[PDB]
């Protein structure tokens, strides 16, 4: 007889740790270092703070291969009343708002905690001091998986009285440093290369210490929360926006105030194409009317593109500097495209190419993938970036031999990167995105085409 039952989000991720990037101990250690750094980076640069990040991994029990991972930053900290949920409630996040951040699911650190609890008994350690008080708060936490609720083991505060803002997070998990070493090193290195306004220090399990000096005090304009762009907004997104209304807006008012690129004239144009009326209440839209708005948004040709205030790019200058410094080529070029939209979300594709000097000779190009400023390291052959690069024909951008020295770099940034898995290692096959990645690559391929014709 079939027995029907329900799972809490925590039970789900605990039954299937692989879903979140925790298939084996090696990937687990890498994933944990990743999640913590991306969390400190979001707590600092998204708020205009020059990042100061400390990463340490120590071997604590050699027989059971448990490593302690500690990441300390100078970010904004977390309000005391939010700490148990932030670190101990699966699907809880300050990044569900429409804004470009490394994080997006409200899961990563909880996934690390769940994996921690299933293999050892030490609670995760959190010390934080938000941008204000005289207090530093310490917490020790466990997740109650059946209920998906935090359990506060330890809780305390002291007086700091200095000017210490930031967060320290320490998790203990099974790991395999030998198997994770190179990837962990590459991850931090590829992050450093595109984050010159940040300082990092990394001490590995064997005591090797690496310092990555800040090179500039110039911090890019922090991304902000923005309204969705109408193009691609779906039926359920629309009704979620409707229910979250605190008045009884008309359709026209709803259009002009809830979306980017819609002003009076666009709104009127939208209404006519959609066969709706300016002054009706949006709360009374039928299921079918909603369908009409959505299709009308898809087929509308005159939408002003999304602002850039929601996005934060690396920039043509830095991408270039970066390629030259790592590969020392004869030629390098890059492009930062104008903002587009897919499924309501603004995005930008940037691309870079490098073709000479110290670049190894190969049959295929070296592909460097980035997403929302995160270096992608695993599963390259599953990524759309790889698919598009593969599909490009270089025999007509200059590369004559079937053997060449090229480095291709693609960065995708959006208020939503569509990963193939919650472990965030590869980008899914989304049409508007493949299309715009191909457009970015072609811009740089042409810049190369000229060179190879010039040289």
Binding site for ligand ANP (CB under 6 A): 2, 35, 39-40, 43, 73, 75-78, 86, 93-95, 103-110, 167, 169
Q: From the list Mg ion, ligand ANP, a second copy, none, which binds 75 (C-beta under 5 to 8 Å, kind-based)?
A: ligand ANP
| Alpha-carbon gap, residue 254 to 269, rounded angstroms | 14
Q: Is 93 annotated as a binding residue?
A: yes
- Residue 428, SS3 per DSSP: coil
The Cα-based distances of 382 to 192, 350, 386, 455 in angstroms read: 25, 20, 7, 35
User: Helices 108-119 and 25-44 sit at what angle, rounded to 10 degrees?
Assistant: 140
Cα 313-385-381 angle, rounded to 5 deg:
140
For position 108 contacting Mg ion by CB under 5 A, the verdict is yes
Q: Which of 220, 295, 246, 260 is nearest to 98 (CA)?
A: 260
Residue 94 annotated as binding site = yes
Indicate which single residue of 52, 56, 120, 307 sits in contact with a second copy (rule: CB under 8 A): 120
Contact between 21 and Mg ion by CB under 5 A: the answer reads: no
104 has binding-site annotation: yes
Q: How far is 167 from 129, CA to CA, in rounded Å?
A: 7
In whole angstroms, the minimum distance from the beta carbon of 406 to ligand ANP comes to 32
Question: Is 244 a known ligand-binding residue?
Answer: no
Say how far apart CA 313 and CA 319 lie, in whole Å: 10
Question: Quick one: 184 or 319, whose CB is closer to ligand ANP?
Answer: 184
Q: Indicate which single residue of 268, 309, 429, 443 sits in contact with a second copy (rule: CB under 8 A).
A: 429
154 makes contact with a second copy (CB under 8 A): no
Going 99 to 192 to 419 to 412, the CA torsion angle's sign is: positive
Smallest distance, Å, CB 187 to Mg ion? 15
Which residues touch 128 (CB under 8 Å, ≥6 apart)?
Answer: 77, 78, 80, 83, 136, 137, 139, 166, 167, 168
Q: Closer to Mg ion by CB, 39 or 148: give it.
A: 39
Is the CB of 62 or the CB of 159 nearer to a second copy? Answer: 62
Pairing verdict, β 407-414 and 366-371 = parallel
Q: Which does 234 bind (CB under 5 to 8 A by kind): a second copy, Mg ion, ligand ANP, none?
A: a second copy
* CA 16 – CA 90 distance, rounded (Å): 14
Helix (H) or strand (E) holding 452: helix 431-454
CB of 398 to a second copy, least distance (A): 27
Is 381 annotated as contributing to ligand binding?
no
Query: What is the contact mask toward a second copy in residues 5 to 24, using x (rule: CB under 8 A)?
Result: xxxxx-xx-xxx-xx---xx
Q: Is 418 in the site for a second copy (CB under 8 A)?
A: yes
Q: Which does 352 bind (CB under 5 to 8 A by kind): ligand ANP, Mg ion, a second copy, none?
A: none
Q: Site residues for a second copy, window 223-282 (CB under 8 A)?
A: 234-237, 240, 243
Q: Which of 14, 28, 31, 39 binds Mg ion (CB under 5 A)?
A: 39
Asked if residue 418 lies in contact with residue 427, where contact means CB atoms within 8 angstroms, the answer is yes
- Report the partner that residue 40 touches, choosing among Mg ion, ligand ANP, a second copy, none (CB closer than 5 to 8 A by kind): ligand ANP
Our finding on whether 57 is near a second copy (CB under 8 A) is no
CA atoms within 13 A on the CB side of 83: 29
Residue whose structure tokens are 């460097």: 368
Q: What gap in Å lies between CA 16 and CA 447, rounded to an integer? A: 46
Q: Does 421 bind a second copy (CB under 8 A)?
A: yes
State CA 192 to chain mean position distance: 16
Select the binding partner of residue 363 from Mg ion, ligand ANP, a second copy, none (C-beta < 5 to 8 A, by kind). Answer: none
Which has the closest alpha carbon to 187: 409, 378, 339, 411? Answer: 378
Query: Quick check: 53 binds a second copy (CB under 8 A)?
Result: no
Whether 426 contacts 383, CB under 8 Å? yes
Shortest distance, position 304 Cβ to ligand ANP, whole Å: 30
Torsion sign (Cα): 124, 35, 197, 214: positive
The nearest distance, CB 128 to ligand ANP, in angstroms, is 7
Q: Counting contacts by CB under 5 A, is residue 329 touching Mg ion?
A: no
Among 87, 92, 187, 394, the residue binding a second copy under the rule CB under 8 A is 92
Q: Identify the residue among 56, 85, 160, 439 touching a second copy (CB under 8 A).
A: 85
Distance CA 224, CA 95 (A): 11
Phi, psi of 144 (to 5 degrees): -85, 105
**Other residues' Cβ atoms within 10 Å of the Cβ of residue 175:** 26
Q: How far is CA 124 from CA 64, 79, 142, 169, in A?
A: 18, 17, 7, 7
Q: Which residue numbers belong to the known binding site for ATP?
A: 39, 73, 93-95, 104-110, 424
Q: Which residues bind a second copy (CB under 8 A)?
A: 2-9, 11-12, 14-16, 18-19, 23-24, 27, 64, 76, 78, 82, 85-86, 89, 91-94, 96-97, 105-106, 114, 117-121, 145-146, 234-237, 240, 243, 287-288, 290-291, 294-295, 379, 381-382, 416, 418-423, 426, 428-431
Q: Which residue numbers belong to the known binding site?
A: 39, 73, 93-95, 104-110, 424
Q: Which residues bind Mg ion (CB under 5 A)?
A: 39, 103, 108
């Amino acid at each position: 007889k079939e027995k029907f039952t329900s799972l809490s989000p925590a039970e789900f991720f605990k039954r299937n740790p692989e879903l979140a990037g925790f298939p084996n101990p090696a990937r687990a250690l890498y994933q944990t270092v990743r999640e913590l750094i991306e969390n400190s980076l979001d707590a600092t640069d998204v708020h205009g703070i020059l990042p100061n990040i400390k990463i340490t991994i120590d071997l604590i029990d050699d027989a059971r291969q448990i490593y302690k991972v500690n990441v300390v930053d100078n970010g904004i900290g977390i309000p005391p009343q939010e700490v148990p949920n932030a670190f101990g409630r699966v699907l809880y996040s300050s990044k569900y708002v429409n804004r470009q951040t490394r994080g997006m699911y409200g899961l990563g650190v909880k996934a690390a905690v769940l994996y921690s609890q299933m293999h050892q008994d030490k609670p995760i350690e959190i010390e934080t001091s938000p941008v204000n008080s005289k207090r530093i708060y310490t917490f020790k936490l466990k997740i109650d998986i059946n209920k998906n609720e935090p359990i506060i083991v330890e809780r305390g505060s002291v007086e700091n009285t200095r000017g210490f803002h930031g967060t320290s997070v320490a998790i203990s998990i099974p790991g395999d440093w030998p198997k994770a070493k190179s990837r962990i090193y590459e991850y931090i290195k590829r992050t450093y290369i595109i984050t010159p306004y940040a300082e990092f220090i990394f001490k590995d399990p064997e005591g090797n210490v690496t310092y990555y000096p800040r090179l500039t005090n110039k911090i890019p304009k922090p991304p902000q929360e923005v309204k969705p762009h109408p193009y691609g907004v779906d039926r359920e997104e629309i009704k979620i926006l409707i229910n979250n209304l605190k008045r009884d807006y008309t359709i026209k008012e709803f259009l002009v105030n809830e979306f980017q690129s819609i002003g009076d004239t666009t709104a009127d144009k939208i209404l006519e194409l959609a066969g709706l009326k300016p002054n009706k209440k949006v709360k009374n839209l039928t299921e079918e009317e909603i369908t009409r708005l959505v299709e009308t948004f898809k087929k509308y040709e005159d939408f002003r593109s999304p602002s850039a205030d929601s996005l934060s790019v690396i920039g043509e200058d830095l991408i270039e500097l970066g390629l030259k410094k790592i590969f020392n080529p004869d030629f390098a070029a890059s492009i930062t495209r104008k903002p587009k939209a897919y499924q309501g979300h603004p995005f930008i594709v940037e691309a870079g190419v490098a073709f000479g000097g110290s670049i190894p000779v190969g049959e295929e190009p070296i592909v460097l993938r980035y997403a929302n400023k995160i270096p992608l390291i695993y599963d390259e052959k599953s990524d759309v970036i790889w698919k598009v690069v593969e599909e490009l024909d270089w025999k007509r951008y200059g590369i004559e031999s079937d053997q060449y020295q090229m480095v291709v770099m693609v960065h995708l940034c959006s208020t939503k990167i569509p990963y193939k898995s919650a472990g965030k290692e590869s980008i899914a096959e989304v049409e508007d995105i493949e299309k715009e990645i191909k457009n970015a690559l072609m811009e740089v391929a042409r810049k190369l085409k000229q060179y190879l014709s010039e040289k």
